[PDB]
Design a protein around this ligand. Structure first.
Ligand SMILES: [Ca+2]
Length: 285
């Protein structure tokens, strides 16, 4: 393998959202072996930096569900935006229908939700990745995570359009505690050919442009680095990782991965908590 793509939540991160010593060592060893390491997430580039900066970790970063790509030093390689009229349409619908939502842009993550609501969205991420984890451990970690968040409050999505300032829309996360609302959101966009529809947790769905997906971003990067897809591997646990496992020469599912992700994988590693990423590096590739 010459390139390895690694999902962030539920994969590189354990249930306390830490990068274990084992995983950090595995990442550095891979870079030491001359392997290009890429971390791929639906979150913002700055969310990844907040975790990596203190650890001195520098990898390629695919963020906003494949809408954005940065190199190890933070140089921008690509930004794939959602057409503004389509973004307006989506946000107007989400807000009018009472969905919690987060708008990933260049500057920050805009949202009208309050702290409790935003924490609920995050807790859902934690619980979906590790359903077997103690709720108290997950909540404490979710709070630490939120405390390092980079949200910007807005009264209405309208504020993101009624201003004469540049603002690009990369990924839109929609959330609802209700199964009926989640199904309605999925049905509404599952056939939209100008968009990419995925989910990163049991109670959310994410919308990015058609050409913005973890798999397409991986292909885009591999091509630029002159690395054949046959020489690339991707590992993840959640539904939004499906496209990159499919794109990679070798798709790896985390031990705590969703059943559909394990189903399409060529290999399966340990859970995120048991350092599955490190195990894959040393015992699967
Ligand atoms: Ca994940």
């Amino acid at each position: 393998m010459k390139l390895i793509a690694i999902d962030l939540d539920g994969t590189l991160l354990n249930s306390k959202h830490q990068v274990s010593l084992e995983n950090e060592n595995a990442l550095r060893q891979a870079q030491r072996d001359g392997i290009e390491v890429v971390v791929s997430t639906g979150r913002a580039h700055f969310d990844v930096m907040s975790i990596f900066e203190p650890l001195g970790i520098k990898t390629w970063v695919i963020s906003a569900n494949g809408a954005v790509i940065h190199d190890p030093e933070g140089r921008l390689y690509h930004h794939e935006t959602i057409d503004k009229k389509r973004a307006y349409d989506i946000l107007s619908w989400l807000e009018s229908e009472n969905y919690y939502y987060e708008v990933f842009t260049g500057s920050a993550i805009y949202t009208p939700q309050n702290g409790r609501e935003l924490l609920d969205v995050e807790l859902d991420r934690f619980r979906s990745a590790n359903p077997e984890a103690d709720l108290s451990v997950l909540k404490q970690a979710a709070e630490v995570q939120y405390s390092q968040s980079g949200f910007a409050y807005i009264n209405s999505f309208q504020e993101l359009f009624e201003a004469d300032e540049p603002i690009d829309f990369y990924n839109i996360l929609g959330f609802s505690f209700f199964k009926e609302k989640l199904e309605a959101g999925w049905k509404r966009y599952e056939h939209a050919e100008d968009l990419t529809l995925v989910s990163s947790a049991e109670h959310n769905f994410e919308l990015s442009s058609r050409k913005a997906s973890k798999g397409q971003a991986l292909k885009r990067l591999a091509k630029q680095l002159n690395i054949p897809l046959e020489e690339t591997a991707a590992v993840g646990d959640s539904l939004n990782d499906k496209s990159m496992l499919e794109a990679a020469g070798k798709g790896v599912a985390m031990g705590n991965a969703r059943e559909d992700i394990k189903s399409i994988a060529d290999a399966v590693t340990l859970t995120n908590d048991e350092h599955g990423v490190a195990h894959m590096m040393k015992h699967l590739l």
